[PDB]
Amino acid sequence: MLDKIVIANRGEIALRILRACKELGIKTVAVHSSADRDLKHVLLADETVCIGPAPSVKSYLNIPAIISAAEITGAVAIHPGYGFLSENANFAEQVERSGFIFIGPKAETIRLMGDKVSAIAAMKKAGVPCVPGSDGPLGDDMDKNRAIAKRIGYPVIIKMRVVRGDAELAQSISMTRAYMEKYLENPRHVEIQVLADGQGNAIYLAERDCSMQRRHQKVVEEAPAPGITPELRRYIGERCAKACVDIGYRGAGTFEFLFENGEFYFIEMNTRIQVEHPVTEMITGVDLIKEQLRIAAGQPLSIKQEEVHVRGHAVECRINAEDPNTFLPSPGKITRFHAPGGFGVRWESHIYAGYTVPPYYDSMIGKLICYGENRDVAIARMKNALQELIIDGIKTNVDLQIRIMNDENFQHGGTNIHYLEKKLGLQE
Amino acid sequence: LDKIVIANRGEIALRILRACKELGIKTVAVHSSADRDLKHVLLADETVCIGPAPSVKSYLNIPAIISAAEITGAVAIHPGYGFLSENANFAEQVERSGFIFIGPKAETIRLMGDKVSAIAAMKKAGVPCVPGSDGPLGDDMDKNRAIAKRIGYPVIIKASMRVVRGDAELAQSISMTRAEANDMVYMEKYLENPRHVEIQVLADGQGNAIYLAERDCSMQRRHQKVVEEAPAPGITPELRRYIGERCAKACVDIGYRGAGTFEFLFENGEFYFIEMNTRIQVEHPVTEMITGVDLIKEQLRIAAGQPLSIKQEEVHVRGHAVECRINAEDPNTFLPSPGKITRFHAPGGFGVRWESHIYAGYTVPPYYDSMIGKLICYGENRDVAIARMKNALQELIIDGIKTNVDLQIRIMNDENFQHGGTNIHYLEKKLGL
């Protein structure tokens, strides 16, 4: 076990990491911006270091400042959390080069997956399903061209016009010039959790559905994904796990796919922990942060795939300080706060009564996660929980969350990536 | 069930209210005037002030409770734990008044409510009880020693402090015991260092009953439970099945209906019946963690007439759970220590469950008990559960009053508690009581 580590992050995720550390007896060092002196985790850490002024560029994105805090404290490793420098290669490189342990994949691995090109290339070489297309630009031979569209399967997209049958091809292409790709009108956002030890072992931890989005930002997450069967689960899961090995992946990562008509289409890989990891912990019982830490300590993968069992259902609602009708950040002082409690209710947040939400950072202030033996139960608990939560002083999206829980479509399951914006009338 | 009355207060009342909500059941909160601000009361569908502060006048007031049910059109009453939960007259009146009592029948309450009757009934069903001479002792030393040999020393001679540890002192203790005290004496097995292991059951009132593993509640202070855990350390699947089956049988035998618990003394691999709690217990959540069953919802299903949903084969023990009761009390006297909570922060995290009605600004009344919350942590193993509890206790903030938080931390820090299997006297010994 790692003796002591630096938590290069803030807010919710910093507190989540802190608890994992404490459970394993790892000392913690909280680096913070002058404006986060009062963060809950800061108050609970073994040591603290002010790394700069408020602005992330000056604090949280200040590499030298974080490396230094590692060095002066005698820390052995650094945990980037999510966001910030978690997917910054330079950072990782430096960390190691500086003699520290980066709690994530290798910098090479990040570069690899960081670039969309190298990424799909690797995924195809790996056997992971990517979006089908022309495989290079198209020409004049519409006798030819139409042959590939057939192969692709309408509807197709010329890139950007959409075509559905032979007929509209010609003009479509012609008025376009003025590549081809398979078109996914109503897909779901399905992503797979993986863990690899760098030592050749890799397992997948089922999937999560994150279709409820606004501006390409996940608002509600759930696991497992409704409609996904074991075979489908196994097919994709195995493939993701194989890819890990192929690319020499180390740590926790997520393969995100678009899902439609029983098929998956690789979008990207997050080479780090995600916001929504808790839903997976609930249905599998695996603590993902602890595994991260173990893998970092050079330990082999403790879990065997056949040991990974999905039970029950879990839902996550992100709680943000923002005006629910403008969607404008809503920084401020929380005057009154009451967290929900009970069987199957998990609350992940650094906020407390009298805490002031700075304006400098992102608007997510907490995550509420409910688990049940089934989806209906999970949902029912969520509703209750949302009603117990109190957060006064600022505007939040609690009411919206409650409206989603109350949506028939949501309750039935299977809504697509467009539903939310559409339900809100964000299509205009 | 359409609507029910929560005939309790505090944490348990909130516990129940959440279960009714998930089930779509309508809630009626009855409260004393001093309990206007309870969290559950504020969340209930309907509220009714049944009396002034004092329990005798509100919570224990039968006719007030019943009337509240009538006027609201409720179909059942949930007694919770304590108060009137094990009061046969109450159960009886409830039913005769046209409401379903969420608990066993009054007769069962009476039966198990009388030690004599209870023991009597358990022996019958093959539930292990404390061994004894089964009737007064005669003046034949040959047979007396035979009885003592049968039970196993040490024994204690009771008349209708001496510990008999062998044959050499038997005769003298018996004589000496009569010389002192009708005047007849009896012998009983002496249990020097037992643990307190209790078995959780559910019965539908239709021939089905299941056991849901057990709980170790050995950490007690002045006979009050401080920490509870499940499963009990050192209990094998064999030993579990053995006592579990016995207890399910006793249920059928007595025609038990609802949630109930059989408490035992456990020593040297044996169980010895102490008593049966004919209601849900404070410590039920640790069972829910490791089995995944919502006991409060099952009590409601059962009351609705549903038979058991779970089959014994479907009951699985997974992980470990530890519960720390949190009380507002005087550290010397242990009496309630009432007042205004100025600052409050609850712990959170994976495997962390907090059961409490308290909140910042909330005032703890002097009228009731000192319990203000229950913190339960779960882990894939006991060690993890403890670690989590240690951290959770550190995050918990309750200002403005005196609580037993420090004592809980000391306990979690105890080497013996960490080793596990301490007995019923450990806590007081440690504390010097």
Side-chain angles (χ1 to χ4, degrees), chain A residues 1-137 139 145 147-159 162-167 169-170 172-173 176 178-428, chain B residues 1-181 185-433:
Chain A
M1 218 32 100
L2 320 153
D3 207 73
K4 178 189 328 209
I5 80 139
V6 174
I7 305 173
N9 212 295
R10 56 166 329 266
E12 82 72 15
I13 195 68
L15 178 60
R16 165 88 186 86
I17 302 151
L18 179 127
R19 290 177 167 142
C21 289
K22 289 195 133 170
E23 288 181 36
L24 297 161
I26 302 170
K27 287 124 219 165
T28 57
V29 178
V31 298
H32 64 95
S33 78
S34 70
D36 281 334
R37 233 177 255 302
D38 276 350
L39 279 174
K40 187 94 238 170
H41 82 285
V42 159
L43 314 164
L44 301 179
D46 298 317
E47 305 189 64
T48 71
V49 186
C50 182
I51 61 157
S56 317
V57 252
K58 298 239 194 187
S59 43
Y60 302 106
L61 311 168
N62 186 347
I63 303 181
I66 298 152
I67 290 178
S68 182
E71 238 174 322
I72 81 176
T73 47
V76 318
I78 300 199
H79 194 324
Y82 52 70
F84 290 129
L85 300 157
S86 62
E87 290 177 298
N88 178 303
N90 294 318
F91 189 49
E93 243 187 15
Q94 291 202 229
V95 166
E96 321 189 270
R97 205 189 203 207
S98 310
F100 303 111
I101 286 147
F102 186 66
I103 299 156
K106 308 158 153 134
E108 311 118 68
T109 321
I110 299 176
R111 276 163 226 293
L112 184 58
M113 299 307 293
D115 168 59
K116 332 107 143 88
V117 187
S118 42
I120 295 176
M123 291 296 106
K124 279 149 160 176
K125 217 256 233 171
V128 171
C130 316
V131 179
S134 70
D135 297 332
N145 279 242
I148 315 137
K150 203 187 235 273
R151 186 240 311 151
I152 291 198
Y154 297 86
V156 304
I157 195 170
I158 294 132
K159 259 191 227 90
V162 166
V163 186
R164 335 193 166 236
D166 277 79
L169 212 68
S172 250
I173 265 166
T176 291
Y179 77 7
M180 186 189 108
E181 204 154 78
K182 156 158 236 138
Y183 178 70
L184 327 157
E185 231 178 344
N186 298 334
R188 288 163 61 203
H189 184 280
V190 182
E191 63 189 22
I192 314 287
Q193 178 71 63
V194 289
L195 288 172
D197 53 22
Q199 307 167 25
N201 314 282
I203 70 185
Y204 54 97
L205 297 96
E207 81 288 345
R208 307 176 280 255
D209 192 309
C210 317
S211 302
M212 292 288 189
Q213 290 180 32
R214 202 226 123 223
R215 266 76 210 149
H216 296 117
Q217 228 134 28
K218 298 170 185 162
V219 165
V220 176
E221 301 108 349
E222 60 180 314
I228 293 278
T229 59
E231 306 90 306
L232 262 166
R233 167 167 316 113
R234 187 206 224 212
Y235 176 76
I236 196 69
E238 280 185 350
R239 262 150 155 89
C240 292
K242 196 210 283 132
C244 283
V245 184
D246 287 5
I247 76 174
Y249 197 79
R250 155 187 94 182
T254 298
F255 291 85
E256 289 180 359
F257 298 89
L258 279 182
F259 184 60
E260 214 203 7
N261 297 324
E263 290 207 274
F264 288 99
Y265 306 90
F266 172 81
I267 300 172
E268 66 176 341
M269 177 185 197
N270 295 288
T271 60
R272 57 171 168 84
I273 206 78
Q274 283 180 304
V275 166
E276 69 273 24
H277 72 271
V279 293
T280 296
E281 295 194 318
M282 315 293 273
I283 65 159
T284 63
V286 183
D287 186 320
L288 292 168
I289 313 288
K290 300 206 278 202
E291 286 301 321
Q292 277 193 296
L293 305 168
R294 285 152 151 145
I295 285 162
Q299 303 187 197
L301 254 201
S302 37
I303 306 219
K304 277 141 165 177
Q305 186 70 62
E306 71 251 24
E307 333 200 280
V308 176
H309 305 111
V310 167
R311 316 159 162 115
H313 201 92
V315 187
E316 170 185 274
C317 288
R318 290 185 191 211
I319 310 298
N320 296 143
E322 70 198 2
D323 191 313
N325 39 285
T326 63
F327 276 114
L328 249 7
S330 173
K333 198 219 224 8
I334 291 152
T335 68
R336 199 171 44 138
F337 174 66
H338 199 66
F343 192 26
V345 175
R346 171 173 176 186
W347 173 248
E348 295 279 319
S349 185
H350 56 298
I351 73 182
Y352 52 91
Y355 170 78
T356 284
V357 175
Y360 313 129
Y361 319 105
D362 112 296
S363 74
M364 176 178 68
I365 55 171
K367 306 173 311 194
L368 174 55
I369 302 108
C370 291
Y371 172 91
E373 333 102 42
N374 63 50
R375 187 171 191 275
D376 288 329
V377 182
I379 296 183
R381 279 169 181 165
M382 183 62 74
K383 291 166 174 168
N384 298 169
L386 293 160
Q387 289 138 35
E388 277 179 41
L389 179 66
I390 293 172
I391 306 182
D392 295 335
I394 60 190
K395 281 160 185 157
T396 66
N397 71 328
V398 166
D399 292 301
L400 177 51
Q401 291 291 28
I402 284 169
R403 279 178 71 195
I404 299 184
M405 295 302 101
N406 283 308
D407 185 291
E408 246 174 30
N409 294 138
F410 176 69
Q411 283 177 330
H412 179 48
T415 58
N416 69 37
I417 65 170
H418 303 311
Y419 187 81
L420 183 68
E421 269 150 2
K422 191 290 299 161
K423 209 217 187 192
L424 300 187
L426 278 30
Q427 38 164 182
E428 76 182 276
Chain B
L1 306 172
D2 187 67
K3 182 185 301 202
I4 81 137
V5 158
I6 303 181
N8 220 293
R9 55 173 308 283
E11 73 82 12
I12 193 61
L14 176 58
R15 170 67 178 100
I16 294 171
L17 175 128
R18 289 171 176 141
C20 289
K21 279 169 111 301
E22 287 179 29
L23 280 188
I25 295 155
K26 287 155 277 211
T27 74
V28 177
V30 284
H31 55 104
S32 80
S33 69
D35 285 332
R36 247 225 277 174
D37 286 338
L38 283 168
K39 188 52 133 236
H40 84 288
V41 167
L42 310 178
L43 288 161
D45 299 312
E46 295 183 272
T47 77
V48 182
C49 175
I50 55 181
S55 327
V56 311
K57 309 226 213 110
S58 39
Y59 304 103
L60 306 172
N61 174 24
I62 296 159
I65 287 132
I66 285 163
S67 159
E70 282 165 17
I71 6 147
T72 60
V75 289
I77 303 178
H78 202 310
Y81 56 66
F83 294 107
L84 305 160
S85 66
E86 288 182 296
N87 179 306
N89 305 334
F90 183 48
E92 203 166 80
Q93 256 174 270
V94 161
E95 272 182 359
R96 95 179 99 88
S97 306
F99 303 102
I100 289 172
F101 171 84
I102 305 174
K105 301 156 125 186
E107 352 164 349
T108 316
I109 294 177
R110 286 210 183 93
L111 164 55
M112 306 301 300
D114 172 355
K115 185 194 192 249
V116 155
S117 318
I119 309 268
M122 301 292 110
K123 273 182 162 171
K124 228 179 143 192
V127 170
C129 282
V130 175
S133 63
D134 310 311
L137 297 176
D139 2 271
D140 184 321
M141 246 2 95
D142 285 309
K143 62 163 99 147
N144 284 334
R145 282 182 252 94
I147 293 142
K149 178 189 216 162
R150 195 209 88 216
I151 285 166
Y153 294 101
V155 307
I156 217 104
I157 305 300
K158 247 144 177 181
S160 1
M161 222 235 214
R162 234 162 105 140
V163 198
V164 183
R165 297 204 187 261
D167 287 330
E169 63 266 32
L170 191 59
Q172 276 178 356
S173 309
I174 297 179
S175 325
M176 165 145 264
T177 276
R178 280 164 162 153
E180 234 233 279
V185 292
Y186 67 89
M187 188 184 308
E188 196 186 278
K189 181 149 179 94
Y190 185 52
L191 295 182
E192 221 166 342
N193 305 130
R195 287 160 57 179
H196 174 119
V197 182
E198 66 188 22
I199 293 77
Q200 178 73 64
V201 304
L202 281 176
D204 55 16
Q206 336 177 344
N208 309 301
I210 57 186
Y211 54 95
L212 296 107
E214 65 290 327
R215 302 179 288 251
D216 192 308
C217 307
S218 311
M219 282 290 184
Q220 314 182 347
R221 178 176 66 192
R222 280 158 104 194
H223 300 275
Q224 282 183 149
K225 291 154 174 181
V226 188
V227 176
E228 306 100 351
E229 64 182 311
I235 300 292
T236 68
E238 225 60 37
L239 214 41
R240 175 167 307 127
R241 169 170 197 194
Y242 154 70
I243 191 75
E245 284 187 5
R246 263 116 166 143
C247 292
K249 145 139 215 256
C251 277
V252 179
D253 279 0
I254 66 176
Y256 195 73
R257 175 194 58 181
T261 301
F262 284 83
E263 310 197 313
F264 292 96
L265 289 169
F266 177 71
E267 211 185 13
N268 280 307
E270 307 276 338
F271 286 105
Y272 308 100
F273 179 72
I274 291 164
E275 85 191 83
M276 188 178 201
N277 307 287
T278 62
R279 50 166 178 94
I280 200 73
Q281 274 176 315
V282 167
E283 68 268 31
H284 75 273
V286 296
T287 295
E288 302 181 323
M289 303 309 266
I290 61 149
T291 61
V293 174
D294 190 314
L295 295 167
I296 301 284
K297 283 207 259 191
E298 285 304 333
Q299 272 188 306
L300 307 164
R301 285 183 180 111
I302 285 163
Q306 300 180 211
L308 274 182
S309 5
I310 343 260
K311 283 180 206 236
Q312 196 71 60
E313 34 157 320
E314 290 174 278
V315 181
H316 309 94
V317 175
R318 304 156 168 136
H320 201 94
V322 176
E323 176 174 85
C324 286
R325 294 179 187 211
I326 303 307
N327 307 131
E329 59 177 26
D330 191 286
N332 300 121
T333 72
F334 321 135
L335 271 148
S337 160
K340 189 185 252 155
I341 296 168
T342 55
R343 190 170 55 134
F344 177 64
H345 199 60
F350 193 26
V352 175
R353 180 178 163 184
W354 171 238
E355 296 282 325
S356 183
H357 47 307
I358 70 184
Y359 59 84
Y362 168 74
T363 302
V364 179
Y367 317 105
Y368 320 105
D369 77 302
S370 56
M371 199 171 80
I372 60 172
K374 321 178 295 209
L375 174 61
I376 307 107
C377 294
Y378 169 86
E380 64 260 30
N381 65 53
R382 188 167 187 272
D383 293 329
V384 167
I386 299 176
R388 267 166 198 165
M389 180 72 74
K390 271 172 183 169
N391 301 165
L393 279 164
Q394 299 151 37
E395 289 197 24
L396 169 77
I397 293 159
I398 312 169
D399 290 334
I401 53 190
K402 292 180 169 133
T403 70
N404 56 343
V405 174
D406 288 323
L407 162 72
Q408 293 295 16
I409 281 167
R410 286 173 65 218
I411 295 191
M412 292 303 108
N413 282 282
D414 190 289
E415 44 171 3
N416 302 292
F417 174 66
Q418 323 172 328
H419 165 59
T422 64
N423 64 51
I424 56 150
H425 311 292
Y426 185 92
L427 186 62
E428 275 159 340
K429 218 145 153 133
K430 179 216 220 198
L431 282 207
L433 265 67

